[PDB]
Design a protein around this nucleic acid. Structure first.
Lengths: 212, 136, 68
RNA sequence: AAAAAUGUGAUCUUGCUUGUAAAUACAAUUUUGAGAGGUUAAUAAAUUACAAGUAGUGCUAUUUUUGUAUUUAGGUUAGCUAUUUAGCUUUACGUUC
RNA sequence: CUAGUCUGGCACGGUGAAGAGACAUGAGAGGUGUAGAAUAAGUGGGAGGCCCGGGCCGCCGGUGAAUACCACUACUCUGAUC
């Protein structure tokens, strides 16, 4: 399952063909998935950790009550302890909005003794299901998920996605994370009979045009 | 085995070399030329007793089983070239000539040109058996 | 594990302009297989055909031959 | 009937592949027409507590009255003899149970 | 044990035509579980962006994963190859 190279992955100084839109484009990485079963427990999912800002940002909630309350005040979000857990239970049903007022969540390690009951087919069918196969812990991962760290999930119908920078971002933010999102997205390996085929470039919007 | 023909006015012709010596029955359907072979069967295939393999019933048991396998490829008409042992031995045909030919007139086939095709000489090598005869 | 009267396709035969009826009959040969062709072997038959069936109403005793 | 809900981060347990462990003939039929060689050479099937992985499902719980309900109780194939009274086939209606 | 004799391989030792394949690189078609006004292929898609002061496919009602433009694999037929 081996690529290496690092020969001279300079030369994105023809990359104006990526950004044609008015807004800023979310530059990406995605290899097509050979060597893979749908339903099984052939668990191909670590949680690769980058260095500098690809910026995955969605509205995070801290459901932790030991060291997860103290060390999740560094990002500085008005903490809500027992009326954050009670808000999702029968409060806003007849009022037209859903009872959440959240987006992201914690795969519970601080409240691991209060975890095993209801929450199954609301989050799971949606695919916003909080795990530690993708840094949903919200304490030291509140300074990494919102800004730095990343994953590649496991599921039935055979799919992938992962970031490195943007097109705000400059040549410092394009190539030095490409060095850490290739070593670390190669060693992560089942003696996979080389899905090492070709690893494609990507942004926010379009049609086919290939690279390695 | 499906020959393309006009469904309501054409029968596919052929020829059968009917060998008829006294000690065995033979029937042998071939093409117009005679070169290939489609449906061959003897009296020996049917009956099992050395003395009665060429008998008129051991000549009729073969001819029905020609026309069974001769009606599944789908042939209707046939030319004929009968025999008798011949050469420098008997030229009168054997007891598998009419009971082999009249059987296929009842078993779903048409009859066309008939003749003899014995071997006959202009003259011959000396014949087996003595000057003094075959005593019995 | 085989049926021998599949590998046989029905072709046609002809006669020259000097005799009356054009269509004699049919003949069967194997396909292009191993190393032998279906138009190489099919080039030297003899059809010992009469005259009556070749014409409208003749004396039938004469015969003929017509090689490919 | 009515299921509200405080309810191990609003409900719920049901999908599936596998290990041991425990239950499958009248007379047959083929065989071996034969007291036995070969009632061969088929079969089916069949259920579950645990060990890694899924279609599906993300795996805990107080109560009130329940049906005032007795911890909710009995029955039938009802067959006919003569005009009603009177009598009484365990369900043969191949015959007997 | 062995000189000779028989047999295989490997080198000197190259060109063309046709028969039948493997196996790939560059293309054109190529998608109807229920359901949705509409042939349900998979993911980060995503309320957004192209041209020629304006349009359009959509957000929307909805099924257990939604129409623009960056990426090619599961899967099925097409034929030319330095």
């Amino acid at each position: 399952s081996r690529d290496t190279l690092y020969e001279a992955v300079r030369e994105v100084l023809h990359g104006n063909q990526r950004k044609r839109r008015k807004f800023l484009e979310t530059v990406e990485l995605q290899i097509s998935l050979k060597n893979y079963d749908p339903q099984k427990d052939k668990r191909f999912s670590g949680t690769v950790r980058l260095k500098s800002t690809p910026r995955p940002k969605f509205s995070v909630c801290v459901l932790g009550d030991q060291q997860h309350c103290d060390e999740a005040k560094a990002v500085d979000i008005p903490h809500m302890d027992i009326e954050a857990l009670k808000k999702l239970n029968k409060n806003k049903k007849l009022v037209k909005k859903l009872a959440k007022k959240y987006d992201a969540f914690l795969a519970s390690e601080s409240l691991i003794k209060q975890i095993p009951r209801i929450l199954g087919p609301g989050l799971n069918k949606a695919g916003k299901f909080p795990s530690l196969l993708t840094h949903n812990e919200n304490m030291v991962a509140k300074v990494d998920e919102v800004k730095s760290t990343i994953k590649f999930q496991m599921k039935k119908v055979l799919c992938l996605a992962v970031a490195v920078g943007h097109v705000k971002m400059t040549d410092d933010e394009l190539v030095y994370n490409i060095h850490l999102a290739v070593n670390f997205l190669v060693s992560l390996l089942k003696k996979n009979w080389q899905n090492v085929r070709a690893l494609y470039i990507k942004s926010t919007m379009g049609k086919p045009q290939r690279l390695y | 085995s499906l020959g393309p023909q006009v469904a309501e006015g054409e029968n596919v012709f052929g020829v059968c070399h009917i060998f008829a010596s006294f000690n065995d029955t033979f029937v042998h359907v071939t093409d117009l030329s005679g070169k290939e072979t489609i449906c061959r069967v003897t009296g020996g295939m049917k009956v099992k007793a050395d003395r009665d393999e060429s008998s008129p019933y051991a000549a009729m048991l073969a001819a029905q089983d020609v026309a069974q396998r001769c009606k599944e490829l789908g042939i209707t008409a046939l030319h004929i070239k009968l025999r008798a042992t011949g050469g420098n031995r008997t030229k009168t045909p054997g007891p598998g000539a009419q009971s082999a030919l009249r059987a296929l007139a009842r078993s779903g086939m048409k009859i066309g040109r008939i003749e003899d095709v014995t071997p006959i000489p202009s003259d011959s090598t000396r014949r087996k058996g003595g000057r003094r005869g075959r005593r019995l | 594990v085989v049926d021998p009267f599949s590998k046989k396709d029905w072709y046609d035969v002809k006669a020259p302009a000097m005799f009356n009826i054009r269509n004699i009959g049919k003949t069967l040969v194997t396909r292009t297989q191993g190393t032998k062709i279906a138009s190489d072997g099919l080039k030297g038959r003899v059809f010992e055909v009469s005259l009556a069936d070749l014409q409208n109403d003749e004396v039938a005793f004469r015969k003929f031959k017509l090689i490919t």
